[PDB]
Amino acid sequence: NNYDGDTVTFSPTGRLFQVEYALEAIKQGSVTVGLRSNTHAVLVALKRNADELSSYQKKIIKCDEHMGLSLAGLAPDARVLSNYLRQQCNYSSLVFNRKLAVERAGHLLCDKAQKNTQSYGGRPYGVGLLIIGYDKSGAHLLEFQPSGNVTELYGTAIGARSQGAKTYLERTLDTFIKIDGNPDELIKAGVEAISQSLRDESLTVDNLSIAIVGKDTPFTIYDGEAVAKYI
Amino acid sequence: QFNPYGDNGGTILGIAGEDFAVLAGDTRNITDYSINSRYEPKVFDCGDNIVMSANGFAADGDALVKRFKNSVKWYHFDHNDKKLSINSAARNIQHLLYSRRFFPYYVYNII
Amino acid sequence: GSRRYDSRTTIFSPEGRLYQVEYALESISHAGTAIGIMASDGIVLAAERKVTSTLLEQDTSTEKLYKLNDKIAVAVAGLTADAEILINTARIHAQNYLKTYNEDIPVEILVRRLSDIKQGYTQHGGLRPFGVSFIYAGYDDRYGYQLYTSNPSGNYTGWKAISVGANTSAAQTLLQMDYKDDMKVDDAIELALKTLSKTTDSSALTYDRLEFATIRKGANDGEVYQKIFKPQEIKDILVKTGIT
Amino acid sequence: TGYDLSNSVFSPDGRNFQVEYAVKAVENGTTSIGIKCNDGVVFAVEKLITSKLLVPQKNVKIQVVDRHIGCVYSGLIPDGRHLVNRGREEAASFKKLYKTPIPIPAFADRLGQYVQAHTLYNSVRPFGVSTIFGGVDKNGAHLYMLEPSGSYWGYKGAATGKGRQSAKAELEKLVDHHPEGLSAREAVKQAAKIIYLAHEDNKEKDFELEISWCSLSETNGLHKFVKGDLLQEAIDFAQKEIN
Amino acid sequence: MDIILGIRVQDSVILASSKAVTRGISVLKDSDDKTRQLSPHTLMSFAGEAGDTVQFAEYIQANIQLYSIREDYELSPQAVSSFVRQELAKSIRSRRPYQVNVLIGGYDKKKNKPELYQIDYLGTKVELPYGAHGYSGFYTFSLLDHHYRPDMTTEEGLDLLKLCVQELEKRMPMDFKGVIVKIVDKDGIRQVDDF
Amino acid sequence: GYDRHITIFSPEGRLYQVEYAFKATNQTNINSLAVRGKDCTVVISQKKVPDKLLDPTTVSYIFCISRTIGMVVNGPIPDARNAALRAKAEAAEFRYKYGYDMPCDVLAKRMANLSQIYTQRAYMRPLGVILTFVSVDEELGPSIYKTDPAGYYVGYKATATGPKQQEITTNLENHFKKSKIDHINEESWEKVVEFAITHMIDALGTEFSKNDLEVGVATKDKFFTLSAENIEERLVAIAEQ
Amino acid sequence: DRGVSTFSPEGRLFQVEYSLEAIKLGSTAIGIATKEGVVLGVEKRATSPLLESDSIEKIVEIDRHIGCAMSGLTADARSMIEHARTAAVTHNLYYDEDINVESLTQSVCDLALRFGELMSRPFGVALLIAGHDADDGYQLFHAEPSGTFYRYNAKAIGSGSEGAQAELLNEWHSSLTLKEAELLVLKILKQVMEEKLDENNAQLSCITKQDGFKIYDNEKTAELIKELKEKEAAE
Amino acid sequence: GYDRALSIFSPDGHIFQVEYALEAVKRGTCAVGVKGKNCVVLGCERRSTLKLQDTRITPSKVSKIDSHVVLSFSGLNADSRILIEKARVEAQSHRLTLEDPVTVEYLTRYVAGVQQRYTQSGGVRPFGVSTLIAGFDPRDDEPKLYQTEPSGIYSSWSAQTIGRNSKTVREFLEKNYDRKEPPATVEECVKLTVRSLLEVVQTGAKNIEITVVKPDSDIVALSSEEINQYVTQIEQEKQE
Amino acid sequence: MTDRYSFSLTTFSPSGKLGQIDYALTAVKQGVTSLGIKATNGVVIATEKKSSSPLAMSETLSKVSLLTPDIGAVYSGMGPDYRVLVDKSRKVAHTSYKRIYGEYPPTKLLVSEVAKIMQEATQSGGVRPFGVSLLIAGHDEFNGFSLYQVDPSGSYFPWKATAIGKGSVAAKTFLEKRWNDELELEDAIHIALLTLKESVEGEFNGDTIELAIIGDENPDLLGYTGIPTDKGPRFRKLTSQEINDRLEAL
Ligand SMILES: [Cl-]
Numbered sequence A: 001n002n003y004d005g006d007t008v009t010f011s012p013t014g015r016l017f018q019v020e021y022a023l024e025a026i027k028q029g030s031v032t033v034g035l036r037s038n039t040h041a042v043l044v045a046l047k048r049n050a051d052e053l054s055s056y057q058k059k060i061i062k063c064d065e066h067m068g069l070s071l072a073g074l075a076p077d078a079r080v081l082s083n084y085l086r087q088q089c090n091y092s093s094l095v096f097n098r099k100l101a102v103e104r105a106g107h108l109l110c111d112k113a114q115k116n117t118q119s120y121g122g123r124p125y126g127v128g129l130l131i132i133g134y135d136k137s138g139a140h141l142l143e144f145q146p147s148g149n150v151t152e153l154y155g156t157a158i159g160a161r162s163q164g165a166k167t168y169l170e171r172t173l174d175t176f177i178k179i180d181g182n183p184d185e186l187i188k189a190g191v192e193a194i195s196q197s198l199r200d201e202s203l204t205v206d207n208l209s210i211a212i213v214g215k216d217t218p219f220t221i222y223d224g225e226a227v228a229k230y231i
Numbered sequence B: 001q002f003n004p005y006g007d008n009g010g011t012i013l014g015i016a017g018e019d020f021a022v023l024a025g026d027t028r029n030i031t032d033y034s035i036n037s038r039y040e041p042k043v044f045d046c047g048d049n050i051v052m053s054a055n056g057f058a059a060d061g062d063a064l065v066k067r068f069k070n071s072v073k074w075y076h077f078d079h080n081d082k083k084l085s086i087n088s089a090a091r092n093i094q095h096l097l098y099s100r101r102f103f104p105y106y107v108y109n110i111i
Numbered sequence C: 001g002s003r004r005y006d007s008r009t010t011i012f013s014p015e016g017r018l019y020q021v022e023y024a025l026e027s028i029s030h031a032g033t034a035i036g037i038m039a040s041d042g043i044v045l046a047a048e049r050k051v052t053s054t055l056l057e058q059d060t061s062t063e064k065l066y067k068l069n070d071k072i073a074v075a076v077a078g079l080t081a082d083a084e085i086l087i088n089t090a091r092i093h094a095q096n097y098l099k100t101y102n103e104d105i106p107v108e109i110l111v112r113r114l115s116d117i118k119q120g121y122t123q124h125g126g127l128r129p130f131g132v133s134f135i136y137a138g139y140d141d142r143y144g145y146q147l148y149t150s151n152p153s154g155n156y157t158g159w160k161a162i163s164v165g166a167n168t169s170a171a172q173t174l175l176q177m178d179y180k181d182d183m184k185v186d187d188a189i190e191l192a193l194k195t196l197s198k199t200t201d202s203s204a205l206t207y208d209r210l211e212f213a214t215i216r217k218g219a220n221d222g223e224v225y226q227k228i229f230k231p232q233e234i235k236d237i238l239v240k241t242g243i244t
Numbered sequence D: 001t002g003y004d005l006s007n008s009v010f011s012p013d014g015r016n017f018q019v020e021y022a023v024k025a026v027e028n029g030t031t032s033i034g035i036k037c038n039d040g041v042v043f044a045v046e047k048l049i050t051s052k053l054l055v056p057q058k059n060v061k062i063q064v065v066d067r068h069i070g071c072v073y074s075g076l077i078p079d080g081r082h083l084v085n086r087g088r089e090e091a092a093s094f095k096k097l098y099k100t101p102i103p104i105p106a107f108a109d110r111l112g113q114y115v116q117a118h119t120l121y122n123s124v125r126p127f128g129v130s131t132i133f134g135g136v137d138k139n140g141a142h143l144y145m146l147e148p149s150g151s152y153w154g155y156k157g158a159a160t161g162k163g164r165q166s167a168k169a170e171l172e173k174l175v176d177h178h179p180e181g182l183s184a185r186e187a188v189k190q191a192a193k194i195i196y197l198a199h200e201d202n203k204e205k206d207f208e209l210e211i212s213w214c215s216l217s218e219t220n221g222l223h224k225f226v227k228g229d230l231l232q233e234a235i236d237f238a239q240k241e242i243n
Numbered sequence E: 001m002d003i004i005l006g007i008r009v010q011d012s013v014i015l016a017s018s019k020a021v022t023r024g025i026s027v028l029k030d031s032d033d034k035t036r037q038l039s040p041h042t043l044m045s046f047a048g049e050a051g052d053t054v055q056f057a058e059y060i061q062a063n064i065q066l067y068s069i070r071e072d073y074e075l076s077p078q079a080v081s082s083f084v085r086q087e088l089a090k091s092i093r094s095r096r097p098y099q100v101n102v103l104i105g106g107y108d109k110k111k112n113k114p115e116l117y118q119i120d121y122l123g124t125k126v127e128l129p130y131g132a133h134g135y136s137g138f139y140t141f142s143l144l145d146h147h148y149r150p151d152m153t154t155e156e157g158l159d160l161l162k163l164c165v166q167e168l169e170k171r172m173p174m175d176f177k178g179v180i181v182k183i184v185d186k187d188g189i190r191q192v193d194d195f
Numbered sequence F: 001g002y003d004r005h006i007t008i009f010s011p012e013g014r015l016y017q018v019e020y021a022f023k024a025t026n027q028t029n030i031n032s033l034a035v036r037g038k039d040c041t042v043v044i045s046q047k048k049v050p051d052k053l054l055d056p057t058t059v060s061y062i063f064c065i066s067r068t069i070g071m072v073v074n075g076p077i078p079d080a081r082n083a084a085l086r087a088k089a090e091a092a093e094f095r096y097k098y099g100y101d102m103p104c105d106v107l108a109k110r111m112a113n114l115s116q117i118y119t120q121r122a123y124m125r126p127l128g129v130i131l132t133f134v135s136v137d138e139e140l141g142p143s144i145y146k147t148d149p150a151g152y153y154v155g156y157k158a159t160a161t162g163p164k165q166q167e168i169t170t171n172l173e174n175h176f177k178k179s180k181i182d183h184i185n186e187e188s189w190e191k192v193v194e195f196a197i198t199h200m201i202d203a204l205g206t207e208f209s210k211n212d213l214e215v216g217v218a219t220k221d222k223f224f225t226l227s228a229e230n231i232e233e234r235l236v237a238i239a240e241q
Numbered sequence G: 001d002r003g004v005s006t007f008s009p010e011g012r013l014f015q016v017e018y019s020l021e022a023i024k025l026g027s028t029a030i031g032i033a034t035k036e037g038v039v040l041g042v043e044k045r046a047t048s049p050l051l052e053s054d055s056i057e058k059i060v061e062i063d064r065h066i067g068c069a070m071s072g073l074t075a076d077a078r079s080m081i082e083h084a085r086t087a088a089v090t091h092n093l094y095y096d097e098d099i100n101v102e103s104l105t106q107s108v109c110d111l112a113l114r115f116g117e118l119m120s121r122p123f124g125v126a127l128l129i130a131g132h133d134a135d136d137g138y139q140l141f142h143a144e145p146s147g148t149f150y151r152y153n154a155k156a157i158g159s160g161s162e163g164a165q166a167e168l169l170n171e172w173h174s175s176l177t178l179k180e181a182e183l184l185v186l187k188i189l190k191q192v193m194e195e196k197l198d199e200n201n202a203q204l205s206c207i208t209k210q211d212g213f214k215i216y217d218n219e220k221t222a223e224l225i226k227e228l229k230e231k232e233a234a235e
Numbered sequence H: 001g002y003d004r005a006l007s008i009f010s011p012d013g014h015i016f017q018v019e020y021a022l023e024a025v026k027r028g029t030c031a032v033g034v035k036g037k038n039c040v041v042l043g044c045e046r047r048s049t050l051k052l053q054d055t056r057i058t059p060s061k062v063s064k065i066d067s068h069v070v071l072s073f074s075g076l077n078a079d080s081r082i083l084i085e086k087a088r089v090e091a092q093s094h095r096l097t098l099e100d101p102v103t104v105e106y107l108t109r110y111v112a113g114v115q116q117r118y119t120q121s122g123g124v125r126p127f128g129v130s131t132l133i134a135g136f137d138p139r140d141d142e143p144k145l146y147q148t149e150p151s152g153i154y155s156s157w158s159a160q161t162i163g164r165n166s167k168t169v170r171e172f173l174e175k176n177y178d179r180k181e182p183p184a185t186v187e188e189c190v191k192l193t194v195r196s197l198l199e200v201v202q203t204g205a206k207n208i209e210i211t212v213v214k215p216d217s218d219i220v221a222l223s224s225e226e227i228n229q230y231v232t233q234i235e236q237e238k239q240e
Numbered sequence I: 001m002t003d004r005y006s007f008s009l010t011t012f013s014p015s016g017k018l019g020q021i022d023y024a025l026t027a028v029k030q031g032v033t034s035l036g037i038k039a040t041n042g043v044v045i046a047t048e049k050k051s052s053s054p055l056a057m058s059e060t061l062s063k064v065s066l067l068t069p070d071i072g073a074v075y076s077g078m079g080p081d082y083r084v085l086v087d088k089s090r091k092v093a094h095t096s097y098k099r100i101y102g103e104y105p106p107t108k109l110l111v112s113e114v115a116k117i118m119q120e121a122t123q124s125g126g127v128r129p130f131g132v133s134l135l136i137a138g139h140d141e142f143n144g145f146s147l148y149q150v151d152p153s154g155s156y157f158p159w160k161a162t163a164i165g166k167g168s169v170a171a172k173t174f175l176e177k178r179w180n181d182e183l184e185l186e187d188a189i190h191i192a193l194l195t196l197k198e199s200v201e202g203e204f205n206g207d208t209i210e211l212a213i214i215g216d217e218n219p220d221l222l223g224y225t226g227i228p229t230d231k232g233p234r235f236r237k238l239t240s241q242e243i244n245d246r247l248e249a250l
């Protein structure tokens, strides 16, 4: 009300409204789902178009051979944050000959977003990210919020109507975690999960976007007729 | 006085065929009259069907290769996984080398 | 953050005016009147000190008339402290020009430089403008005797006769009436004092409430002399013209 | 009025309302505690399980500074991380220049001055965390607690977050019933109990217990996490006491 | 470059400047004009290190042309010469000084007098009736000391200048490929196409 | 009404942020007192540890700025420590640059100048503290100099600070009106501390245990704080006469 | 007042949303992509008859294989075009090749959100970036001041955009020829324009693989306008 | 440094500071530009509220940017000096780096770019000035006349006017100026420029300034008597 | 952090007033009375030592300050602002004059430098004006004795005699009646003590009054002998005893 003019102002109840408004931008964004087993990790994203003449906005971005994310909210902010991850993944390789741990990647994103929430002049990031990866401690899935909060999860979903997919994963927890050495079945579970967030529209060939990373599988994105198999 | 340069010896050789190409190099690494290694790889697969060798001062050669490999990585990120053609790689390497016109990479490079 | 307390000194009104410049001009309108009159054989600068005291040391005092170099002088109307900042800058600019070209600075060039500094404070920096209006009296070998004025907007114009400060509307009418092109310095001196005597808010115009100066070619042969009048000399010229 | 809209503005009371609003964010957070024992310190924290999808034992909240200091906090988690990152820089530059690891009181002031600095200007926001921290140095064990205002003191026991009153009450009993002192292994057991007892204020969602400790005898004066059998032993002791 | 001469007569200033430009052991050009018009009644010839000469001259030219437009007024030769001196005096204590020597020939329209200024790369200014830079003066100043009068005509100034060039051509080891001569007077600047 | 938020003049020619900083000074509800002996300067302050969970050894508003200079603060601890750290840094820098130990009054002036800047510059807030510096200066002898948020400072024969400063002030005023001297005519610092405690007891009307007080003593070439047991010995001597 | 980079309660940047309103006030620009080329057309909209219309430059060359049309505060586009041209030629310097249309568009869109308290506000202009490369063929992009860019088969921006976009919805198909696209741009421009369309107040352009980016002459456009009138009168 | 964003978008998609800068131009004295077949003429109003003025030394309304290009304006006088100075510096800078004088189109594009930069830079306000830039390109006999405004947009004009009561004189030019046959001579071009100002000026004495620019750096300013003859001839034909 | 107040805090209001300067002058009005009188062979400046507490040692607080050996200053208004101005005035006398010309600045030029500092606080970003009016008395070879007033705006005026602060209006009237151009220094001191008694409520003696003079050279206060041209400072602060002696002949 009077305490939402900038990011440097607490409300009387201890709330940061500019951060909460940035969080709102994620809820307006299109749905994206993340889930993993012990061997693989999968991202599934519902892409959004402006109209029938327009293309479908890309949702998934590659950060390294072993790491990448999906976005929901302001796309330009995801480009900035993904670029930062690309650099950090790359700094780890060039200096330490070491693939960046997914947990450490989350810590770096948290700290980058935080600086924007405590200083005058700037603004919080208006995007949520689902980071997947495979490192020395196996498969991983992270959820990033622009408040700074990063959370390691078995599965999750963000965006509009994301609660439906999140409930499904909460039921299926014991099943999909055990899908080891079977990428196609893990993707099926992700496609079935994101389907719980659909209304009116359904999954078409240029609508669906899938990504996967695993033990002997580099981070690869599937679009177009490559995802027709899973429709 | 500190001399930032050195000579690690070695020799490299590139030949272009009609539908193929070779890049060869010896595996010996030396300083003065001593041998450092009898097997120290000098020719590298840099991705996109490109091979590279920077011969002369090993430290500068390893730095150049490491930088070009990095340039290939960022070419994919920035330009939708497009393949870096051999002519485009050559021009990119020219700018990597001339960035140190006044403190050169002490290497003879071949791709 | 800090934005909350910013007055925004360099913005347009809906009507296309600069608020702070207009308000600075309002300040200047309460300042003591200063008059400049240009003649064929010299220039006169006359100015009124504001409600003085008997205990003010007049002979060592200077609030209105300042010397920029040997050829150029200025009359001040507004905040004296602000004027001194600008005056010292102008003094330096004249010396920079002399060092560079080995010639005294042309009057207009000095005027343009000061006016450009005033302009800058209206367009960028977020600071208040200088609440000062100058009358420049000077001489050079290109245009001869010259009168200029500058105000907080940074706009400057040339004049045959001009007033700044209080009662300029009334003062300009009186000057426009009695001024002629073939006029001489001694006549211009009389016009300047007569105009102040009629426009003044004081009961009577006396020597202790005035600063006066002339720029004359009335110097031995082809050269120019600046004369800042002393208290006794102002008293004499007041008797001569028949005001006291 | 309007005195609460900007940081570093004194109200007519002489209060900085923005710092007081930062405290409200701390009070909103999960419960965290600290216990000073005979030859060291024990830290424990409440982790709310928002969903079954959270991977157990992965989202670690307690952080180490240098190798001998533990830090835990309640409130805005990112703000706490920022403070620990600074703490690590401070501890590094101290050791760089003076060779010896940073003493706990010295370290406490480094955080204190930094947090206090964020109450001096309207261009920055105060920290939305209360931080409990400490460890073992040349002079023995030290436990501290640091508020958004930059205010900190030494403590026998410390608690902050939504269940702080419940915790404080339990800590006060231990101080009274053990004037000669408490052992490190006892403090771990008691820490578990207090977090479980303090969980009645966050009783809607179930939670995960996380404990760490520094002890001269038990950990050689280094910070370590309580894991495996010792953690389960503390959980069993805690579960037995609530029933 | 090599040789630049100057002479101030009754009603004009005459500048003579060599045409040769050499890189390595080869004369690349034998028709080079070592001069720039600073203003309608002010001409500057120059000589010094390769590249620096033209860069400096064009930089001065731009500054004077800028002044002319701003004030709608031509600076006096004295004022221009002072500006140039200061730039060279500023330059000599720089990281890399501009190694340029100049002669400034101008006609002052106010005083109705020709004026010749000699300025070296250090910023050493002198007003002279006749001047030169480098070794040129060693051969020519004896002739000028003998033959020069202040009431000389432009035609007599050119004849005395021819004698100076003939002496240079006889006793200098270097071939400077003749000179381009220019005259600065009340009517402006013109080039003597046959010399 | 933004003239009450930052340090600019109100129509009355007042600085409200400075005035409100003075009010923050009493937020701790602690009273301090300083007096001068022949060879020493004593400063006492109330100590209040309300929470049983606190480590009482770490609760302190008296600081050792340098070997010679001591400082007691009236105000919140964060601002107190802010000032303490700065005074320590300034005292050390002074010795390095000018080759001798920074005098008490000079440090007081320096800290007062820094405080003045906060009353003039908008981006910096005043510190809500009153700083009382004490020492035995090598030129001026026993010294008490006090700084406030306005940037004001002055030397003192004796002084008091806190919510009940006036009661202590008048008590001290009445004593120096009798003795007609600018100090406590006493040889040992022990008896000067006893005087300080006794007159605080009389002024405030409260009895003190060893843990209710905090004492700092300045002698030639060193300033030091008393332990609880040193204070107990002091309280015993008072009760026995 | 309020921050320049402030979020609204709905989760949108105020200034970005307000810049979009300025673009709605701008003159109409239309782009249509086909397999034979991409056509770009604009409404010139001269404020007076004394204004020499040929000096109105709302269609602009970025490279030989990339063109650009603009709508909104067209003065803001000059620095964007300068950056685009520099980016295009700089990539040719570093990689000895033409730059991808998408990569060029991305480079332009990176400027968009570089504002705060960098430039003081977002751009008040939208761009239609059309071009061709070997990888993805003929392409048309719509670059906004939000930093977002969508690829389009056909797109209209400016004052008559929603009316023109509805018309482009029905008319566009994947087998359109270049000549058909030219007439289609002229048809829709004529529909949404206030004044009567002619060769002087409307401009055409295209990009083909062979000839590259070309702005059409007024004589050439005039014939296409006459060809349009006759085919509409034919039924 | 002072970084405050002064020029910003409003809910309806307007930049008020730029629009208020146009109001400052509306207040300024009238300026007019007319291009003939082999010349361009720049006319300028001088408000007669200011008498006792020294017309020798008072800043003239038309300013030479180079020997072949001129610039007149309407709006804040002080603001115009900054644009003129920058323009003059760029003109010499172009000659120095490219060895050709600026084209009229290039110079206009530069001045317009400066005006634009001040609409999206922090801590600065827009120029309250619109300009008319006229001249002939090097070795070209085709006349050039451009206009700029605070927003930074520019365009070429057969004839144009800016400043106070510019709406009226533009109305006059729109019906009197024929594109198929423009003012063939200098006289016809000046006559049309004076006629247009006489719709607005008041008195035709010292209130009208005229500057004729011809090809090959031939620029001259008309005197009071020369202009007064045009004023006399126009009104004598009007009495019919 | 960073000082983000790069804009002026003093601005012109619609009426043409500079509010913060006016308000600063109001703060000066509330301040304790101080005065200055110029004689033929000297200058005197005086003020009341308004002690905040009787426990406070008022000798340690110096309201009258030496700026150079021949220039002194006194104020009315906010003491802390005065203290920092004295520090800056002392330094600027060295940096912008003595280190250049090898001698101390004349009164009028040092006043000009102080004035400039106060003007900048009236226009620069993120600062308020100084809340003091200064009276600066001094002597130099070519101008003789002089007395200047300096206001929060940065404006300065030379005076024969004047007063500032609490009872300045009444004090200036008192000085107008008593002042003449033939006053000796002792006569000016006498008049200063008479004028100052009217504005003081409580005790009026050498311990509650601060008074200094600019007069004859004091070789006894120089600190060394051997250089004839160095004859000592003209500034001298009168002692408590010296004041009381002149209060008996009052
Ligand atoms: Cl200081």
Ligand SMILES: [Mg+2]
Pocket (backbone or CB within 6 Å): E118, E119, E120, E124, E125, E126
């Ligand atoms: Mg020489």
Ligand SMILES: [Mg+2]
Pocket (backbone or CB within 6 Å): F006, F007, F118, F119, F120, F121, F122, F123, F124, F125, F126
């Ligand atoms: Mg402040």
